Symmetry: C2
Subunit: 161 residues, 2 copies
């Protein structure tokens, strides 16, 4: 009777849309210091964000653009957040993918895009060489911090100004 | 400045959902003869359909199940309609894919799932050997109709009863 047989998501769409609209209101009213975000256009699932390099960090003076993409499975799956602007950082690769716990295994539906951006700012201030996406940058941070920071400042001026 | 850069659909979701709900009401009130359809569950994009073999056809007495899947691009892209129940028919393959003009290049957004099902019934009554998906069945229809129809009746009894 298996022999008789030959060989997008309504509910999740409704829940994700409800959450995203709430988060938009929240981040507009109470944005994280140095960061803004909102829809690029008519599609509520695709946002842009601007982050200013944190004061005192090697990224100070930079203006960085991020793409934030929600799936219909939001908030049960994390948003996809990538840097569009090139940045020299051991946790952020050439595709702009960010190694941040809460964007992967440590995501919880209770987290907000405001909390995610705050966390990304914290990562720009204090990188995490224990979990790098760019090995050479992480080893350089550990072994030749002066060169690391010179390069990070140079890339900030070159690509983020 | 391209050098500065690193290397689901709100609007369509709203339009597709509006259309699908209207079509559901229509097909419930005024179903095509010998056919029924509606959502399998909570997801409005995934429907089931039952088609009875058309009277007088070699499929008479069969009860056939179809999967109908809408995309967020509906009605601008056609629904995906496949037979779940095995059927011996030159326009319907072993994956249940149906060779019907209106399901591919001849789709228009004005067409309804009621019109699609009517068309599928017409195809079960009058197959189209000019555009087959199963070559051997089409050639057999042309050259040995008696064997074709014997086999179609046998497969109806075996898999659709």
């Amino acid at each position: 009777q298996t022999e008789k047989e030959t060989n997008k998501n309504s509910k999740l769409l409704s829940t994700s849309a409800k959450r995203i609209q709430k988060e938009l209101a929240d981040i507009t009213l109470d944005p994280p210091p140095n960061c803004s975000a909102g829809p690029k256009g008519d599609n509520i699932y695709e946002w842009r964000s601007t982050i200013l390099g944190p004061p005192g960090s090697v990224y100070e003076g930079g203006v960085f653009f991020l793409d934030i993409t929600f799936t219909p499975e939001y908030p049960f799956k994390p948003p996809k957040v990538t840097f569009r602007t090139r940045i020299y950082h051991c946790n952020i690769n050439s595709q702009g993918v960010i190694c941040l716990d809460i964007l992967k295994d440590n995501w919880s539906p209770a987290l907000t895009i405001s909390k995610v951006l705050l966390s990304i700012c914290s990562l720009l201030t204090d990188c995490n060489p224990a979990d790098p996406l760019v090995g050479s940058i992480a080893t350089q941070y550990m072994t030749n911090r002066a060169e690391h920071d010179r390069m990070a400042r140079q890339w900030t001026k070159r690509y983020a100004t």
